[PDB]
């Protein structure tokens, strides 16, 4: 399973079977055959394997990283602190990449499930995707293949000086 808040789905509304003709469709027979022949032995084997899982219940944990100081409060050419800052920033970089991938999955799943009216019915996912791509592009784009926290901080200082000059010239 997963979490239905980070991976949202609108509630499924299937219509009732309302047959108009008198000819029986093959799909009811095929669903009954797929339930008897296929679904029940798969369910029996899954119940067997699940009962074998319950005989030995052990666990794996999610790795927690406590927050070390970032690159802004590392002294210049102090490798014992800026190493920790660089590794922290690379882990945050992987996390931000996977956040953008999750929002891509939301956008693609909305474009599939809303059918033909997805241009109207997926403006929320499109706006979320636009926001997260704008934030990811302001944060990590144009760094290069030798990306570092020094490069990203220098890009942030360049962008903040551009924003401050645009604010002062509009004063």
């Amino acid at each position: 399973s997963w979490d239905k808040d980070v991976y949202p789905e609108p509630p499924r509304r299937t219509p009732a079977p309302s047959p108009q003709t008198s000819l029986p469709n093959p799909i009811t027979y095929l669903t009954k055959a797929f339930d008897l022949l296929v679904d029940r032995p798969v369910t029996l084997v899954r119940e067997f394997i699940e009962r074998q899982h319950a005989k030995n219940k052990y666990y794996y944990y999610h790795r927690e990283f406590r927050r070390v100081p970032d690159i802004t409060e590392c002294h210049e050419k102090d490798v014992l602190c800026m190493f920790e800052a660089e590794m922290q920033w690379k882990r945050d970089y992987k996390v931000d990449q996977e956040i953008v991938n999750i929002i891509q999955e939301r956008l693609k799943a909305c474009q599939q499930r809303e059918g033909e009216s997805h241009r109207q019915n997926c403006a929320k996912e499109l706006q979320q995707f636009t926001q997260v791509v704008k934030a990811y592009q302001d944060r990590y784009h144009d760094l290069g293949a030798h990306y570092s926290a020094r490069k990203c901080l220098a890009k942030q200082k360049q962008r903040m000086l551009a924003e401050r000059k645009a604010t002062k010239e509009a004063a």
Binding site: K77, V79, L80, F83, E84, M87
Partner: protein, 63 residues
């Protein structure tokens, strides 16, 4: 290996190598200052011993 082992082993490696790098820079600046000034123990090129000088009363007084 554990990520703890790699992480703290990398921190020890970085401490040793940063200490060596700052000491190499200090070594170059010490060599520069000692060759320029000549007041350190290195680059002490030999001069004449003063123990070779004879201080006995010589044959003529004006010396």
């Amino acid at each position: 290996d554990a990520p703890e082992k790699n992480y703290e082993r990398t921190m020890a490696i970085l401490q040793i190598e940063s200490e060596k790098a700052e000491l190499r820079l200090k070594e170059l600046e010490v060599r520069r200052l000692m060759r320029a000034k000549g007041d350190g123990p290195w680059f002490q090129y030999p001069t004449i011993d003063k123990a070779l000088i004879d201080h006995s009363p010589k044959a003529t007084p004006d010396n």
